[PDB]
């Protein structure tokens, strides 16, 4: 099984005590534990996220974990990108207790569980 | 006469039975029929569309056909880019029967006529 | 694919700056672009239009584009002629922003797009 | 860091397609990924859970994950056992979307995330 | 003292009689007068602005002047980028007399003073 | 281009941490930046301000920046002096967030921007 994790704008500035590299290592260590392959991606560009989602359709990704950051509350382009790949299961993640445009085009949401929310989302895709 | 056709985010995933390459062939074939030159462009980046609109002003484009996709419903930056080039006539196009921020800064809109909407828009710029 | 274009009374007096021969050249050029065969016909006689619609049924026309002119608002004979050939898809076209008796027996209407309305109608029959 | 996972009555009958041994392997694999030691325990006896909670106090467990099953809705004895060890952080977990007596004596609850809820709870204790 | 000036989308099309190169020369001349070092940046990409703000945090910039253009009215990503660097003082600028999402995360706003608004904003950071 | 800056009563006691000599150096440095000649004048006498405004008319000053201090709230003589030289553009400046008699006989007011308000006013006279 192959999983793709997508982080939106500003997420790389976690810790600015756990930082973004701590979250990446927790995700990569959990992937070995669950016996899955994982790719982790972050960008500040809305278009680079849409390109990464379109690349996932051509690369047989088995499921997607996404944290859009602030794009959750205004990016109808990322909503419609997630709607264009409806064959792939996706879970939306929020680190803090953040109405949203990307939720109804996803198979579930995890909110307010801190850095543990990604680990639930990966578990929900293995189930 | 030189026409520029601009496609917004997600439009390259048409048919994911007619697809995006079928639409490009229909536009390029119709340009020869109308005896005009055409450039067709697509990007998932909001800033690449604004760069392409600014490039058109320095390149003596005679008219613009634009399908913003989802940016129609939230991109005040693309609205104000179209407002900055008021000397050039533009037609907005929607493939499906989709309130919009980009409409009042254009000379017309074509809506819900499928892939035929681009062919009306090219005709309306020749007239 | 074979297309038939029918123009009603008075349409030959367009431009009495684009005239009727400009419209015929736009249609014939666009047909090569879309890789289709096209016949363009005009008459001032209501009965010659009904004869042309009956001829089309015996000639394996794949789709019809029609602009009835003023007959749109009173010719129940042309309505019932279009109803008699229900196996063939037809699009109704109006050049200017014109209740209509011929619309409910057609697969769609295109209105107020100038001479561009024929090009959308040909696109909608290829789709 | 040392974690203790406690499962209540009936939890060993999961899958009577994922079963209880699948959940134990997911937890043990995730523990290696997070670089923590884990003990996983299940019993049908209310008193054996209270003995295990009392043993944890003498064994320097750094955090507890607990799924009481039905005891959530009536066991004031397990509530008061969790209250007696207030120096140790605990997270409560429910597999399905199950008022509760054990919740207010814990640092958090995770509900309805399936077998993924344990993985969030371990993350929330590492954070 | 080191100052960073950020211009958003469309600002490079000022005067399409003073233009964007006049504004850059006024800012660079004023910086020598105030005895400060200045960097002036412009982009049409929302993500390139967020990258430039994140780069400023690693480069010990003493204060920021920002004119977001249209992003002022919808970019919650640029708002949250400005919030992520709260150690650095920022002034927001609007050339024309433009409710705004980026204002409450800045230490002041200058509005409707034309190209003079940048000179006040530099003064307010030297003070 | 020649600019005249007039400061009213009490302005020489700024900082009784930036003082009046700091403000004069900021103005003289900004004048070199904008490529303009500047004269800076201060007096506690209402009549010496009126003499300086009458001198400006005979010396072809291209624009005036004025901070009247408290004379803003009662000096109809300085108001009518500014009205007597309607051929010269003037900007009124207030350092702190101070109804006024001198405002309607000026081309604009700048208020509450600290010592930055003078630099905006010089920018507005070059524009």
Residue numbers in the entry:
A (entry chain V), B (entry chain P), C (entry chain T), D (entry chain 2), E (entry chain I), F (entry chain E): 1 to 16, 24 to 105, 114 to 142
Could you pull the original sentences from the published paper?
Here, we develop a general method for designing self-assembling proteins that uses predicted structures of oligomeric proteins from thermophilic organisms as building blocks. Of the 359 identified thermophilic trimer homologs, 191 yielded high-confidence AF2 predictions [predicted aligned error (pAE) < 5, predicted local distance difference test (pLDDT) > 90]. We docked these predicted structures in the so-called “I3” architecture by aligning their threefold symmetry axes to the corresponding axes of icosahedral point group symmetry, using the Rosetta SymDofMover to sample the translational and rotational degrees of freedom along this shared axis [Fig. 1C, (27)]. To evaluate the accuracy of our design method at high resolution, we used single-particle cryoelectron microscopy (cryo-EM) to determine the structures of one nanoparticle from each of the successful PDB seeds.
